[PDB]
């Protein structure tokens, strides 16, 4: 029952002592949901020496099952049965996502037991993605795994993976099937993730003060709570909203943090657990940094702020994670550490002005099942790396100017691309995405709409638009990897140019999807007056290189691209 943990400056592992092991329904407000198959624990490496780390679990639709309101009993179906949320047979294979965080500065050993004591397997029976990073792994003599993880200024964010855990999904091109159909993925049923993260840079964790920080009691979350300081902390505990906007209390996923103007600085310690989520009201630059998490699990798909937090969808008002609708200009989101846990929407938009940007890193997103669930903004000039985010919607939102994406590990679902480009015509130059490792993927359906491929491009949201010959998008995607019977390279519905747009260095080690669903097949339609400039180098697929000779649709490359752009493309 007392966890034995270790905290110092070479490494450090938490716990929470209201840990509930729950697979079927909410827990409790102050407790965390934990795994139910798996512990962790850390030792520096070689001294036997091990400590517990706390395992998370989140699931799909977090307990609360197909809801319309977040005040409706748990399962109760009272989401309107034409609404697809995203979810369909996750629950009935018993699909769910474990993760554990820690921090480090010295090679550490991370061992991993089953719960109910059995064999996870032999170490030639686990699999660590991504797989672009190779990890020495032992078998303990209580049948445990052994990962050495070497120290890292970057950290290291990875899944262990056990064959006899790994499910199928199986696809008719319609809906996931029970049997028949195509093999449209390959995945735990129980993930398990590891955070190993590197203790934050010293400016990131803000000094403070009685007058300069409103420190947080463990416990409910109540309307003006948070005050009115430069800094919002959350100490080390579990803490939920436990209101409606009116003040009426025991209400769960009801309301949000609506910060005043002063705060700046939502610091989440490790170890700490906070159900809600953050709007920002500042206009200086703004930070989320630390090594807590934040969770939307008691938030209903779609989440309406705007509107009793009820599932109706609203662009402008359903809840985002981390939110901003007031302006201001030359501002930067510094986000460093931070984990977001079962959004219900959109993870992160910042409103008002068109002045932002963001400094993103050491950045974790999990648990994320609903559909919409995407990745962060990529805002002007933007540099994002090492980040790990399981996602059921656009993963990398390529809108703007001069952002660099960086060793960034997406888990993709069954929703929209990973590099999202389209949805209207847009001017971008002086992008860099590099070290782009794909670890899953799980598409039911081939579709152009939502594209499911790795480098996709919506056609317009909104209609009554033109594609616009005066716009381009030129960027540089290089190492790219996506493991698995994979999606199509790309789908893009061009809405304007493309010019100087480089992809090099992309590996299909698990070969293209190649069955009668179609989603390994590369599209790329006819736009009259518009340029395809796409400079393709060094793509493999199953250990073969593509080739102009072997890139067609019917061939090993797959890439329908239409043959009004010849001359404008090459693979070389
Ligand atoms: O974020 C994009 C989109 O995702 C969800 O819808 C996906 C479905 O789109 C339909 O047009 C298509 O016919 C289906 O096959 C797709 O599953 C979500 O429902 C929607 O609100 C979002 O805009």
Not at 168 to 181: A, K
Not at 221 to 226: A, L
Not at 250 to 256: A, I, R, V, W, Y
Not at 454 to 462: Q, T, V, W
Request: glycine letters at 10%; charged letters at 15%.
């Amino acid at each position: 029952t007392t966890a034995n943990t270790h905290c110092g400056a070479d490494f450090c592992t938490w716990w929470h002592d209201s840990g509930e092991i729950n697979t079927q329904t909410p827990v409790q407000p102050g407790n965390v949901r934990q795994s139910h198959k798996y512990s962790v624990q850390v030792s520096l490496a070689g001294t036997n020496n091990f400590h517990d780390s706390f395992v998370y679990e989140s699931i799909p639709r977090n307990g609360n099952g197909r809801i319309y309101a977040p005040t409706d009993p748990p399962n109760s179906n009272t989401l309107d049965s034409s609404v697809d949320d995203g979810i369909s047979i996750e629950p009935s294979i018993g699909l769910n996502m474990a993760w554990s965080q820690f921090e480090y500065s010295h090679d550490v050993d991370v061992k991993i037991l089953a719960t109910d004591g059995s064999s996870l397997g032999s170490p030639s029976d686990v699999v660590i993605r991504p797989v672009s990073i190779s990890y020495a792994i032992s078998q303990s003599d209580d049948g445990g795994i052994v990962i050495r993880v070497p120290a890292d200024a970057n950290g290291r964010k990875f899944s262990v993976e056990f064959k006899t855990d790994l499910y199928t999904f199986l696809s008719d091109g319609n809906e996931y099937v029970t049997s028949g159909g195509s093999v449209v993925g390959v995945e735990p049923t129980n993930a398990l993730v590891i955070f190993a993260s590197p203790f934050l840079p010293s400016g990131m964790i803000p000094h403070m003060t009685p007058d300069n920080t409103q420190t947080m009691t463990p416990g409910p979350i109540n309307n003006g709570d948070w005050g009115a300081k430069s800094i919002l902390y959350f100490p080390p505990g579990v803490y939920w909203m436990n209101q409606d906007q009116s003040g009426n209390s025991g209400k769960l996923g009801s309301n949000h943090i609506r910060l005043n103007s002063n705060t700046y600085w939502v610091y989440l310690a490790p170890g700490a657990y906070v159900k809600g989520a953050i709007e920002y009201f500042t206009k200086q630059n703004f930070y989320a940094t630390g090594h807590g998490i934040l969770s939307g699990e008691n938030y209903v798909y779609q989440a309406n702020a705007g509107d009793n937090y009820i599932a109706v969808k609203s662009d402008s008002t359903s809840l985002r994670m981390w939110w901003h609708n007031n302006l201001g200009g030359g501002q930067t989101w510094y986000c460093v550490g931070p984990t977001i846990n079962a959004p219900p929407f959109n993870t992160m938009d910042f409103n008002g002005n068109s002045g932002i940007s963001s400094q993103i890193s050491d950045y974790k997103q999990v648990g994320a099942f609903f559909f919409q669930t995407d990745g962060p903004e990529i805002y002007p000039n933007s540099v994002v790396h090492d980040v790990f985010w399981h996602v059921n919607d656009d993963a990398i939102k390529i809108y703007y100017s001069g952002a660099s994406v960086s060793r960034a590990t997406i888990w993709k679902c069954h929703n929209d691309p990973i590099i999202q480009m389209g949805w209207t015509s847009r001017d971008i130059s002086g992008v860099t995405i590099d070290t782009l490792n794909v670890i899953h993927t799980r598409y039911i359906k081939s579709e152009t709409v939502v594209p499911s491929a790795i480098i996709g491009a919506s056609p317009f949201y909104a209609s009554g638009m033109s594609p616009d010959s005066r716009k381009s998008i030129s960027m540089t995607v290089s190492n790219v990897v996506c493991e698995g019977l994979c999606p199509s390279l790309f789908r893009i519905t061009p809405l304007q140019n493309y010019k100087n747009f480089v992809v090099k260095n992309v590996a299909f080690p698990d070969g293209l999807q190649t069955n009668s669903i179609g989603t390994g097949e590369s599209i790329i339609p006819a736009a009259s007056g518009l340029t395809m400039g796409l400079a393709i180098s060094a793509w493999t697929i199953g250990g073969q290189k593509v080739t102009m000779e072997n890139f067609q649709a019917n061939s090993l490359g797959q890439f329908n691209i239409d043959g009004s752009y010849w001359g404008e493309w090459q693979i070389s």
